[PDB]
Amino acid sequence: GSELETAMETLINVFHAHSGKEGDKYKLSKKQLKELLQTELSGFLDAQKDVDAVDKVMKELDENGDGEVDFQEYVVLVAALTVACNNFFWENS
């Protein structure tokens, strides 16, 4: 297909949107990322099938505050929580 490209542009759209606000408009911070993550995934957080997995990521930012990440990194996490809330990947039957 070709929709894949549409998704990539969508992810960057949001990331670029929160890129401003507070901090330098070039990268996201661990503290700021904490909000950006849930702020958007707020819908998924509503019902987490595996909070234990998400907790690891939530506390990960708590440990590092002055730290930072990149765009790709923002794409990895979102997928981590998406799976935790989505059981369409835990199928075994």
Which residue is it, tokens 């957080």? 45
Closest approach, Cβ 78 to a copy of itself, in A, equals: 7
Integer angstrom CA distances of residue 40 from 19, 27, 35, 37: 14, 17, 8, 6
Closest approach, Cβ 31 to a copy of itself, in A, equals: 19
Q: Output the CA angle 69-56-64, nearest 5 degrees.
A: 40
Residue closer to a copy of itself, measured from CB, 54 or 78 = 78
Closest approach, Cβ 39 to a copy of itself, in A, equals: 9
Taking alpha carbons only, the member of 43, 47, 44, 22 closest to residue 33 is 22
List residues near a copy of itself by CB under 8 A: 1-8, 10-14, 17, 26, 40-41, 43-44, 70-72, 75-76, 78-80, 82-83, 86, 88-89, 91
